[PDB]
Amino acid sequence: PFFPPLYLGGPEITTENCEREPIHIPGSIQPHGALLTADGHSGEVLQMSLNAATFLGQEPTVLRGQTLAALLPEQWPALQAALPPGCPDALQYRATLDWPAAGHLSLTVHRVGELLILEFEPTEPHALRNAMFALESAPNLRALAEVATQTVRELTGFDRVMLYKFAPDATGEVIAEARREGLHAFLGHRFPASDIPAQARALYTRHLLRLTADTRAAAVPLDPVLNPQTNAPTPLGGAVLRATSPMHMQYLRNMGVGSSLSVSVVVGGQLWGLIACHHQTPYVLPPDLRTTLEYLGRLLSLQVQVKEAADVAAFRQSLREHHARVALAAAHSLSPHDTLSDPALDLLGLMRAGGLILRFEGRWQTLGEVPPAPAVDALLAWLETQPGALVQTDALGQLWPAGADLAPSAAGLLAISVGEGWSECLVWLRPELRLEVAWGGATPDQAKDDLGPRHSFDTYLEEKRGYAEPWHPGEIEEAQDLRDTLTGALGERLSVIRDLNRALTQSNAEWRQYGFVISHHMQEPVRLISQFAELLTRQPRAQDGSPDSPQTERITGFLLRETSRLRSLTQDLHTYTAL
Amino acid sequence: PFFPPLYLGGPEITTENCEREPIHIPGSIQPHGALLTADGHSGEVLQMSLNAATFLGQEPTVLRGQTLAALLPEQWPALQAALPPGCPDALQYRATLDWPGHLSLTVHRVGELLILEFEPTEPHALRNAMFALESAPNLRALAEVATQTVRELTGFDRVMLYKFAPDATGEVIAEARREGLHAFLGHRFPASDIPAQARALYTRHLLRLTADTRAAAVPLDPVLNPQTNAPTPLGGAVLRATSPMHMQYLRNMGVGSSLSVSVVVGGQLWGLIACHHQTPYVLPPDLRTTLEYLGRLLSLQVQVKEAADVAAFRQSLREHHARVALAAAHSLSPHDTLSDPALDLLGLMRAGGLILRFEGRWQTLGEVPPAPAVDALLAWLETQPGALVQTDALGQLWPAGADLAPSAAGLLAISVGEGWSECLVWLRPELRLEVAWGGATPDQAKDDLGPRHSFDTYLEEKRGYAEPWHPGEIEEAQDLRDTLTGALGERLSVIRDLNRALTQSNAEWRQYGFVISHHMQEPVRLISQFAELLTRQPRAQDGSPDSPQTERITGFLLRETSRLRSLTQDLHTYTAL
Ligand SMILES: C=CC1=C(C)/C(=C/C2=[NH+]C(=C\c3[nH]c(/C=C4\NC(=O)[C@@H](C)\C4=C/C)c(C)c3CCC(=O)O)/C(CCC(=O)O)=C2C)NC1=O
Numbered sequence A: 001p002f003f004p005p006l007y008l009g010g011p012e013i014t015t016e017n018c019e020r021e022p023i024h025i026p027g028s029i030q031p032h033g034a035l036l037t038a039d040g041h042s043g044e045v046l047q048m049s050l051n052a053a054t055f056l057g058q059e060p061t062v063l064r065g066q067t068l069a070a071l072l073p074e075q076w077p078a079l080q081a082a083l084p085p086g087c088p089d090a091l092q093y094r095a096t097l098d099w100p101a102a103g104h105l106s107l108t109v110h111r112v113g114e115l116l117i118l119e120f121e122p123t124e125p126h127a128l129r130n131a132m133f134a135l136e137s138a139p140n141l142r143a144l145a146e147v148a149t150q151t152v153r154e155l156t157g158f159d160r161v162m163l164y165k166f167a168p169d170a171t172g173e174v175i176a177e178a179r180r181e182g183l184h185a186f187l188g189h190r191f192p193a194s195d196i197p198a199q200a201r202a203l204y205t206r207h208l209l210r211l212t213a214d215t216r217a218a219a220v221p222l223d224p225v226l227n228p229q230t231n232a233p234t235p236l237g238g239a240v241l242r243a244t245s246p247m248h249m250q251y252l253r254n255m256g257v258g259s260s261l262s263v264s265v266v267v268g269g270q271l272w273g274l275i276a277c278h279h280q281t282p283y284v285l286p287p288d289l290r291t292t293l294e295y296l297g298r299l300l301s302l303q304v305q306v307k308e309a310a311d312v313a314a315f316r317q318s319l320r321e322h323h324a325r326v327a328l329a330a331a332h333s334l335s336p337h338d339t340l341s342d343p344a345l346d347l348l349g350l351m352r353a354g355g356l357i358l359r360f361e362g363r364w365q366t367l368g369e370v371p372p373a374p375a376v377d378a379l380l381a382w383l384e385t386q387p388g389a390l391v392q393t394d395a396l397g398q399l400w401p402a403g404a405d406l407a408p409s410a411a412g413l414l415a416i417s418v419g420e421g422w423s424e425c426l427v428w429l430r431p432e433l434r435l436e437v438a439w440g441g442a443t444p445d446q447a448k449d450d451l452g453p454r455h456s457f458d459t460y461l462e463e464k465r466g467y468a469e470p471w472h473p474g475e476i477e478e479a480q481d482l483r484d485t486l487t488g489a490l491g492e493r494l495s496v497i498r499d500l501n502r503a504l505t506q507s508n509a510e511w512r513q514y515g516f517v518i519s520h521h522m523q524e525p526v527r528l529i530s531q532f533a534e535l536l537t538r539q540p541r542a543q544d545g546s547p548d549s550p551q552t553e554r555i556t557g558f559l560l561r562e563t564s565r566l567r568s569l570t571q572d573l574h575t576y577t578a579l
Numbered sequence B: 001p002f003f004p005p006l007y008l009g010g011p012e013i014t015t016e017n018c019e020r021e022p023i024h025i026p027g028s029i030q031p032h033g034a035l036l037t038a039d040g041h042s043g044e045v046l047q048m049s050l051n052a053a054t055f056l057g058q059e060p061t062v063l064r065g066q067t068l069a070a071l072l073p074e075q076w077p078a079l080q081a082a083l084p085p086g087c088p089d090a091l092q093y094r095a096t097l098d099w100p101g102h103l104s105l106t107v108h109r110v111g112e113l114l115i116l117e118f119e120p121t122e123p124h125a126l127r128n129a130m131f132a133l134e135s136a137p138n139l140r141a142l143a144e145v146a147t148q149t150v151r152e153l154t155g156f157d158r159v160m161l162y163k164f165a166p167d168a169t170g171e172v173i174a175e176a177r178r179e180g181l182h183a184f185l186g187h188r189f190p191a192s193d194i195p196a197q198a199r200a201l202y203t204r205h206l207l208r209l210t211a212d213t214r215a216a217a218v219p220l221d222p223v224l225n226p227q228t229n230a231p232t233p234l235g236g237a238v239l240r241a242t243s244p245m246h247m248q249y250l251r252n253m254g255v256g257s258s259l260s261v262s263v264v265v266g267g268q269l270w271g272l273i274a275c276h277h278q279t280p281y282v283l284p285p286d287l288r289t290t291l292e293y294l295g296r297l298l299s300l301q302v303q304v305k306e307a308a309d310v311a312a313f314r315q316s317l318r319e320h321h322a323r324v325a326l327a328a329a330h331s332l333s334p335h336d337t338l339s340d341p342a343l344d345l346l347g348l349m350r351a352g353g354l355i356l357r358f359e360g361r362w363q364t365l366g367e368v369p370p371a372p373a374v375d376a377l378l379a380w381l382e383t384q385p386g387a388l389v390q391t392d393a394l395g396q397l398w399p400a401g402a403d404l405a406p407s408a409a410g411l412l413a414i415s416v417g418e419g420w421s422e423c424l425v426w427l428r429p430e431l432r433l434e435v436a437w438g439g440a441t442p443d444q445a446k447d448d449l450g451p452r453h454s455f456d457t458y459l460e461e462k463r464g465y466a467e468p469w470h471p472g473e474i475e476e477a478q479d480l481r482d483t484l485t486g487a488l489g490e491r492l493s494v495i496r497d498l499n500r501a502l503t504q505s506n507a508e509w510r511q512y513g514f515v516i517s518h519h520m521q522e523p524v525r526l527i528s529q530f531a532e533l534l535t536r537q538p539r540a541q542d543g544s545p546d547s548p549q550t551e552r553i554t555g556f557l558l559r560e561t562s563r564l565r566s567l568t569q570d571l572h573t574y575t576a577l
């Protein structure tokens, strides 16, 4: 949430509270035109710029309290047709006028809710068509970048044109350039995340072009300053004459620039880069030449998509035979440890790494160049806390500070999680390499020291330690193809272990059956002998001749049935053991 | 492989051999310009059109055997700079000339040859059009804004945005026309009308036209290339003469002038912007350029609006997604979580019948076909190679299950894992379908030798068709698939541990089964060896039996009574364990 503006009452903006700044509501314009705000229905003038009286050529008492029907006889009914109520504020309408005083004026109109903004500017071969075909025929991405910068400098006649590109970590890098002879080179120089605040990145995805005609210019405000309808500051998001933030104005003065111009490159609802332009002297570009730039904004935004997709397709043509066998093996494998650790597939050459870690079942077997054993278990605990399905890093020292000492063995890391929860995984490791980064001006740590912008824009060398070979984007697309084959083959790996679990229940069915029957079928004969031991006590106690005394061998003939009981038992005990 | 052309010696083209036709090598041009071919290095003229003598204004003996340095004083060194040797043939160069009226020149390089084309030449429309498309709400709405804008600039009779299905049949999705004319809107068209080599060409080159349908083709002399002794390729030629097949097709339709612009999304042909005019009509080259911007601007804006339609549809089914994904990730029993009518896994996909197959038992829910036919269907899915099967008509793909139409017409299938071991199937019932075909149906396209006469509304009754799947539903389904295959990792982690516990129980059976069996053999021998004592002493007068010692004999079987006492205790414990 941003702070209120200066005219209403707000704090002075420094380096601490830059993220919260009213950029889109300056309440002022740059002095090479005039501004009028009007009702969406009536057409009555509500606000004016102070210089509008001179720029049009009427008294300011006349213009205030006047319908647009008076000013624009032809334009007014055609303007209402183009911009109906309840439309996106990004939609613009442009028309040329014949004003007798000024000569020729170019008019721009857009609708912010229940208000109509108006902007006025002075106005007057096959270049674009030849440029279009030049981009759609460029071989690679670096080559496309070169063709853009050259072409833009030709049309515009600027001092310096450069294609600026954002990293996924929101830090800039100049990737192409074309300059006037006898000047500095800004090529390669990386730049902080602090220079471009986050709300500006939010704006530049919506509106696509802005400029500054003069850096040492004074802002011309509006009267009345606040909107009559809402009693709030008037929004100037889609305004071309939106006055630049006083912060950024100071930044270009120290650089030595008079005129700025940028065009936002947008890929799939995201800010991919900028086409930034500098001029040493104050300079104004005609509106009919700004239009030509806006086509090159949209043409590039399409052509970036194609060339980046052709680079990854070309890289994944070299590693074709090396892919085919790896994918064929890790799909029919039931033993993951004794197929993927085999140095006939060389699963360190596919990803061009030093150390590979394979984790399946519950034993981390090793291959290549790996760190000491206790530190590996410290690393695998850190991956289980990580939420995704793939972990990609070039510097491990920043993400995990405990493993900053493991730099010589493992600096870069690529990780896959087959399944979910990091139970089974694969890890690639790249060794440490010497790294020197050329920062334009100052490093990101030195950006928060000064109260305003930095003075120096020279080449600065920083020694970075804990950095490996950065991963090619083709390798990560390769890796995710491997992941989904190992998770796909998991379906056949469960289909077997269920069948082995079914066979063990059959063996447990035998143990409980034989363990119960034989135990209780033993209890009767052993009681039968012990109850015949009762007979062996009944006879010789009396010591006299019993009526069983003759048939004592028939009594023995009765325990002969009992001897044959244990005889049949001991035979059955050996058979059930054998199974 | 295409047949050789007519001038060299080839067969007459009919409906049978349309797929094999030399389209890109006609050896002729349309007669509203002139053509010159030249060496890539020397600049000597090698071939000419027959009408080039009149169109430029020199004798044809003069022009043949002349350098380009003579003709173009300014252009020649700037032309060589723009097109270096070994460049894509798609790259073009254009320049305006002052010929004593005005000529517009177009040049491109096919290998070791330089093609040249000549054509007669002379506010904020485009800029306002650009912002109109980038502000359209939906895809249908964007289509409307394109057609209107194109008709305004060009002044054509009929403009229509044409769109291909993934099965390569056309459908007109937007239109704008002159008042008092037929409406072609909605009408579907066959795969036969646009051959496959033309679809291969239109991905490379993006614009072509026909200025007159009843025009005679003006050929080249010499007809064959001097360098290679082969026909001269005219792929990237604007004045490439139209195929005699397609020329007949527009005559029966009642069209004089054709123009189309190829829409290209991600290296694929998405659609066309087709234009018709009843009268012969020529468009100036400076107005063709304006169309070519609208070709590229649309190709970007199609991508955005289609992605916003799927994002909007998958906002309604947000709470209905969240619970389903949360349950089918922690589930260990798939059958007794997903068949539960508290998640309603027939409402997510708006279907009649759901089949769940896990372990090896197909439980049913909703409206399902008879039981033996289900096993016939699951055998057909196992032969299918992919990870998702998507169909609206099952009758065409699987002819054996054409009788199962009332229960199952449409099908969506997922394979959790691989090999169709475990799956999910959705089924939609049969619905009445009437399709409006423009002219004739695809079966009636192969009957006639040439093009069809009728272009009127034709009604065909189609049976075996359900509600066609919304593309947002298929993106929803593939999100479910990867959660069920993802949760499979935890489902194996458990069944191994249960397999470890059953080996412990098998270790007990083999231990107790061996020991007790052999430790029983001794006591039973001890009783049988005491039966030996019972044979030795059947009378008291023997050396062993004394009346006091008979209770010590009983004292010896007291050791045997304590044997079975210790046994019966051990028999109850090993039963419990
Ligand atoms: C050599 C390379 C190079 C870089 C790295 C670069 C960055 C850059 N900043 C931009 C915008 C803004 N930056 C800040 C704030 C700060 N600027 C800082 O550096 C510190 C002092 C700071 C705050 C702590 C603000 C308020 C704005 C919005 C201004 C507005 O539109 O009202 C723009 C777009 C403007 C344009 O087109 O030139 C770019 C491209 N300009 C270059 O040409």
Ligand SMILES: C=CC1=C(C)/C(=C/C2=[NH+]C(=C\c3[nH]c(/C=C4\NC(=O)[C@@H](C)\C4=C/C)c(C)c3CCC(=O)O)/C(CCC(=O)O)=C2C)NC1=O
Pocket: B014, B015, B018, B023, B170, B184, B189, B190, B192, B193, B194, B195, B198, B208, B241, B242, B243, B245, B246, B249, B258, B259, B260, B272, B274, B450, B451
């Ligand atoms: C009302 C809707 C509508 C439809 C459905 C339609 C189709 C269509 N056919 C096209 C192309 C070709 N067709 C054929 C051949 C055949 N044509 C048939 O119908 C049968 C007889 C046949 C072979 C068996 C050939 C050789 C070509 C390549 C021409 C060349 O480049 O030389 C084009 C692009 C041309 C253009 O801009 O008009 C389209 C868009 N034209 C429409 O406006």
